């Protein structure tokens, strides 16, 4: 099928440059244009520009000087590079493909790269168990989870049992603490009778710090 | 650039009702308008192209109409999985521009939260910090109050809340309240209590635990 996969999320120092790679499959770059769109708190969805089949580029007016798009057709790669990021350039960046080669109806999107512009350092999270107990059980249903504390920048991904556990999972939006580091919890409810039989593991992945932790969560 | 104004910012409906999203353009754009759905943590999903043209793999309950400056995205019978934000896009004039979006919220019956409390792990205490977590699970509507108490001392300003987006399957919310203190204060007290107030409870629900 048609797919667009973007490089991992990352931090960018103020006045420094942003580099994202979009690797496509299911179609050839020599036949379709690839566009770049972002989504910020300040200006919502914002079309940034495009590289066409033949290599020509268009850049939206505010970006003609700090934006550069290039590509390697044989490698199915499109490279985005933007210069001199200020903090209001913090946003989600997407690559996109249209339905027809010349058009702008964006039927296929990359997963989007969360880009944080900040002077701070990357910091990996600590993962602490939210242990099930009687204080976290009701009607033969137990609740349990993981506390993913003190990381920067966003995002972290959390799954349960390597993707095999999804029902009853709530992973909370990160909140910024006073220390300037984020924190979140991911919880799941399961049958209490399965606590003595099943293993529960939260798979925590924080790409910007290359931190992967599997935390086993047990009744105490 | 064309200004696209979407109205209203928030729509609130019940399953099975029809719902309509409005998009107005600053000058005529013929029928050059596309509509996108964005779900929680998702990328935009193309629903309708050129005002009214269907898109492969998009449910039949979505349709679009309009020409000129005034456009409408319709869902003929709303489902719980339609909880998202919706955006229009014009491309009659370069550069292509997007409206600011409309949020779709679903109504449902009142559902009381299930309340759970988690003491800090010994693991976390090794680091000199204690996090006590209170979880309010699958409730509606969104508004709720969490009040922390350590040994009958009402806590204030030393907790943070997070609320999930509305569930796509049952339309409920979940809330986590994290009380944060040092290892020293934590070891200095015994009773840790989270009292929860909500419309679906006939009285406040307290979950508590004695340290050790």
């Amino acid at each position: 099928q048609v797919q667009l996969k973007q490089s991992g999320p990352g931090l960018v120092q103020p006045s420094q440059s942003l580099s994202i790679t979009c690797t496509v499959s299911g179609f050839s770059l020599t036949n379709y244009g690839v566009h770049w769109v972002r989504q910020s708190p300040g200006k919502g969805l914002e079309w940034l520009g495009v590289i066409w089949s033949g290599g020509n580029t268009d850049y939206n007016t505010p970006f003609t000087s700090r934006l550069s798009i290039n590509k390697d057709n044989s490698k199915s790669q499109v490279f985005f590079k933007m210069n001199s990021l200020q903090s209001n350039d913090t946003a989600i960046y997407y690559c996109a493909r249209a339905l027809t080669y010349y058009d702008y109806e964006f039927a296929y999107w990359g997963q989007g790269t969360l880009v944080t512009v900040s002077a701070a350092s990357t910091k990996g999270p600590s993962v602490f168990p939210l242990a099930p107990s009687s204080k976290s059980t009701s009607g033969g249903t137990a609740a349990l989870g993981c506390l993913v504390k003190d990381y920067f920048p966003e995002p972290v991904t959390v799954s349960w049992n390597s993707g095999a556990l999804t029902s009853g999972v709530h992973t909370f939006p990160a909140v910024l603490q006073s220390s300037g580091l984020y924190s979140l919890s991911s919880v799941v409810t399961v049958p209490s009778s399965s606590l003595g039989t099943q293993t529960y593991i939260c798979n925590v992945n924080h790409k910007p710090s290359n931190t992967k932790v599997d935390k086993r969560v047990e009744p105490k | 650039d064309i200004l696209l104004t979407q109205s209203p910012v928030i729509l609130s409906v019940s399953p099975g009702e029809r719902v309509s999203f409005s998009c107005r353009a600053s000058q005529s754009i013929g029928t050059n308008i596309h509509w996108y759905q964005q779900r929680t943590n998702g990328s935009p999903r193309l629903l309708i192209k050129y005002a009214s043209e269907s898109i492969s793999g998009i449910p039949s309950r979505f349709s679009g109409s309009g020409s000129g400056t005034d456009f409408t995205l319709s869902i003929n019978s709303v489902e719980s999985e339609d909880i998202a934000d919706y955006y229009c896009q014009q491309n009659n004039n370069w550069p292509t521009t997007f409206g600011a979006g409309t949020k779709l919220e679903l109504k449902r019956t009142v559902a009381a939260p299930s309340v759970f409390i988690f003491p800090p792990s010994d693991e976390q205490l090794k680091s000199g910090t204690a996090s006590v977590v209170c979880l309010l699970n699958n409730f509606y509507p969104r508004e709720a109050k969490v009040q922390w108490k350590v040994d009958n001392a009402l806590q204030s300003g030393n907790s943070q809340e997070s609320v999930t987006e509305q569930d796509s399957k049952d339309s409920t919310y979940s809330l986590s309240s994290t009380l944060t203190l040092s290892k020293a204060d934590y070891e200095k007290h015994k009773v840790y209590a989270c009292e929860v107030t909500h419309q679906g409870l006939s009285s406040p629900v307290t979950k508590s635990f004695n340290r050790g």
Partner: peptide
């Protein structure tokens, strides 16, 4: 207003 944590309007 768009929120980067949830990708939703807040």
């Amino acid at each position: 207003q768009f929120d980067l944590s949830t990708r939703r309007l807040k």
